[PDB]
Structure formats: structure tokens, C-alpha cells
Amino acid sequence: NSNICEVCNKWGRLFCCDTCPRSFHEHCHIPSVEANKNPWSCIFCRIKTIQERCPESQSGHQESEVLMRQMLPEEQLKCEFLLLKVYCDSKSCFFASEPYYNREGSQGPQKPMWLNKVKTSLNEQMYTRVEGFVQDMRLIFHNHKEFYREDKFTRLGIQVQDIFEKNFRNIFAIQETS
Ligand SMILES: [Zn+2]
Ligand SMILES: [Zn+2]
Ligand SMILES: [Zn+2]
């Protein structure tokens, strides 16, 4: 196994996957690394199994159909994995915890949103469809773009949204387009 957390790239108290060489901090893995379970298989491995069990699941899909899916166990897992892929980028630090808004010339968003709030919402099974998770994730970056206006810091929202969107298209096998 690797000697650093796959998510935050630091050492520490690491749980090792039994079926691949990745390792994780307890609360860096999503869901949080399970108490017992020997062997234990990481989210990466669980996602790869879904694909291997249903190879056709990799055929292209329309985004509108994916969004309307109910949050059955496989879709719950796919959203958890997508969330984890965003935390894998170090720039997610800006979006992880609860924001506050006091900048001359700007007003805070009407509906603040942040990664740890989406993480709790997934853990608490608050989303009934994929659409609820995706809308909160896109709202994080939209709020950031609107608040920061012409400040160059706006770019951090574009960057992390691009990580989200690329991983959304990969994990949910969205049909490739020009
Ligand atoms: Zn970590
Ligand atoms: Zn694994
Ligand atoms: Zn099948």
C-alpha cells in the first residue's frame, strides 16, 4: 500500500485498501472508513466493481437522464466518489468549510454552500435524486463566481468546477460531445 492518503497526500493514521494499493485517512475516504470489514475495499475499488459487473454502464448517457435518477445505493456511491474526486484537488480547501461574505461592492449569496455541507447531506441521505447533489455542487462554484466578480480569485471556482465536471462526465458515463 501507498504511505500517503490518496485524497490529501499526507501521511498519518492510514487505512489501507485490501484490493488496491491506495490508502486513506479515516475522514478523507467517503464514506468514512468503516469500523470493521476485513477485507476492506476503498471507493475506487467499489466503483470499478460496478463497472465490471455491468460493462454496458459505460455506454454514453444523457445528463438529463442521469440527474433524474433516484439515489439508490449505486448512485449514492457514485456521488460519494465524485465528491471525493473534488476533495482530491488541493484547491478544494477554499470550498470545504462554511464561507463568510464581507467584501466592499459585493453581497453574499442567498444560499451559501460548501463541500463539508454536501458531505453531511450525503451521509444523512438527504438527496433523493442525483440532481440534488449536482445542483448543490454547482452552486458552490456559481456562488463563488458571482461574489468575487472581477477579482482574479474568481478563477479558483472555475478551476475546481472543471475538476467536478470532468469527473461527473467520467463517473456517470456522460455521452461525449464536441
Ligand atoms: Zn487524507
Ligand atoms: Zn481500493
Ligand atoms: Zn449487466
In the chain, residues preceding a discontinuity (C to N beyond 2.5 A) are: none
Q: How far is the CA of 32 from the centre of ligand 1 (A)?
A: 11
Q: For residues 70 and 93, what is the distance between their CA atoms, to the nearest angstrom?
A: 29
**On the CB side of 120, how many CA atoms lie within 13 Å of its CA?**
7
Residue type, 95: F
Solving technique? X-ray
Going by C-alpha positions, the residue among 88, 20, 61 that lies closest to residue 171 is 61
Q: How far is the CA of 48 from the centre of ligand 2 (A)?
A: 9
Q: How far is the CA of 57 from the centre of ligand 3 (A)?
A: 8
Q: How far is the CA of 175 from the centre of ligand 1 (A)?
A: 32
Cis ω before 21 (30° cut-off from 0): no
> Resolution, in Å, please?
1.4
Q: How far is the CA of 104 from the centre of ligand 1 (A)?
A: 36
**On the CB side of 70, how many CA atoms lie within 13 Å of its CA?**
2
Q: How far is the CA of 21 from the centre of ligand 1 (A)?
A: 15
Those residues whose beta carbon sits under 5 angstroms from the ion ligand 3 are 54
Residues 138/160, Cβ–Cβ less than 8 Å: no
Those residues whose beta carbon sits under 5 angstroms from the ion ligand 2 are 17, 20, 42, 44-45
Residue tagged 461525449 (cell numbers): 176
Strand-pair partners of 15: 24
Q: How far is the CA of 56 from the centre of ligand 3 (A)?
A: 6
Q: For 103-119, b where at least 16 C-beta lie within 10 A, e where not — what string?
A: eeeeeebeeebbbeebb
Q: How far is the CA of 176 from the centre of ligand 1 (A)?
A: 32
- Give, in order, the Cα–Cα distances in Å from 49 to each of 9, 41, 46, 73, 112: 25, 10, 5, 13, 35
Q: How far is the CA of 4 from the centre of ligand 2 (A)?
A: 14
Cis ω before 39 (30° cut-off from 0): yes
Q: How far is the CA of 24 from the centre of ligand 1 (A)?
A: 6
Q: For residues 144 and 99, what is the distance between their CA atoms, to the nearest angstrom?
A: 10
Q: For residues 139 and 119, what is the distance between their CA atoms, to the nearest angstrom?
A: 14
Q: What domains are there in the chain, each with its CATH number?
A: 1-59 (3.30.40.10), 60-178 (1.20.920.10)
Q: How far is the CA of 117 from the centre of ligand 1 (A)?
A: 18
